């Protein structure tokens, strides 16, 4: 059984970063080299392991999280980061073992007149936990007074739409991002290389 990475990487539709999607990978053989050597990604960072040794390793599980952000935010998808993306949308553990893979997706996510379909969370009472997912859509209470389900003074909608315009600079562009997380449990390893 070859690991089904095309289903995640070639998925026709990607989630907004606040409702990021997750698939689990187990009991298969992954060929990382064909992803790494592919020339289809502008970022392929790894944490905890060298990308050149991935085909020699075995893991208990793999998790493929995927979403869309802007390019100039791919640096926030990494342990120890801060800001709205890492704090209210997608947090990585300090001891993250995995790899982050990102690419400009104007191919599929460009829209004449603008694409405002991708959203990110703006406010939160506390920071996310590593791999927590907040998809709620309740009004955010930024004051001592309850909001009672409506906007008002100190009461704001918590999500913001990216203004992906064809005219934008190279950093304010839609980037599809896939995070492979390698599970290092004290268990049999079911996902190995060739």
């Amino acid at each position, epitope marked *: 059984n070859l690991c089904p990475f095309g289903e995640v990487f070639n998925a026709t539709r990607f989630a907004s970063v606040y409702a990021w999607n997750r698939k689990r990978i187990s009991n298969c053989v992954a060929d990382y080299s064909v992803l790494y050597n592919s020339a289809s990604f502008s970022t392929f960072k790894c944490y905890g392991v*060298s990308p050149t040794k991935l085909n020699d390793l075995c893991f208990t599980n793999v998790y493929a999280d995927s979403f869309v952000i802007r390019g100039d935010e791919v640096r926030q998808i990494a342990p120890g980061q801060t800001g709205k993306i890492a704090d209210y949308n997608y947090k990585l553990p300090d001891d993250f073992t995995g*790899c982050v893979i990102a690419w400009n997706s104007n191919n599929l996510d460009s829209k004449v007149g603008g694409n405002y379909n991708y959203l990110y969370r703006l406010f939160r009472k506390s920071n996310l936990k590593p791999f927590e997912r907040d998809i709620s859509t309740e009004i955010y209470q930024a004051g001592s007074t309850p909001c009672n389900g409506v906007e008002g003074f100190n009461c704001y909608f918590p999500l913001q739409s990216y203004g992906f315009q064809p005219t934008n600079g190279v950093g304010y562009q839609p980037y599809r991002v896939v995070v492979l997380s390698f599970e290092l449990l004290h268990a049999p390893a079911t996902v190995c290389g060739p």
Partner: nanobody, 127 residues
Framework: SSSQVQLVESGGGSVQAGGSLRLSCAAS????????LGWFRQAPGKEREGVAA????????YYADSVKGRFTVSLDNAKNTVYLQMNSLKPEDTALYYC??????????????????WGQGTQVTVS
């Protein structure tokens, strides 16, 4: 000093506009762990930016738009040495040039704040 990768760069100097130079960067240490070679640049009064990059396993290259079509980055595994051929030089290329090597994969654009093994920096002047 205690880093398992050591970069020594050379080939700098001065030259007149329209001329060419060839910077070289020779590594010693954990050569096989290096995944990515980036050339950075700091001109007078500007931050250190990214000039060019080479993915070691691939040969694939990236170039900033200010040097696209004039600079060529290339690899030589016989000598463990990466090269930056700078053609059609113009005075705005005057800068301290640095080579840097990563082991964590690759990422474009280059970013100073990633973890890099750094070279010493070789001067390049064009008038």
């Amino acid at each position: 000093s205690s880093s398992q990768v050591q970069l020594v760069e050379s080939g700098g100097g001065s030259v007149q506009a329209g001329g060419s130079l060839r910077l070289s960067c020779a590594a010693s240490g954990s050569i096989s762990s290096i995944t990515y070679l980036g050339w950075f640049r700091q001109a007078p009064g500007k931050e250190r930016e990214g000039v060019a990059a080479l993915i070691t396993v691939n040969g694939h290259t990236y170039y900033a738009d200010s040097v696209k079509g004039r600079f060529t980055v290339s690899l030589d595994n016989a000598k463990n040495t990466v090269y930056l051929q700078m053609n059609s030089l113009k005075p705005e290329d005057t800068a301290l040039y640095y080579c840097a090597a990563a082991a964590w994969g690759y990422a474009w654009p280059l970013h100073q704040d990633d973890y890099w093994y750094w070279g010493q920096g070789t001067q390049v002047t064009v008038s």
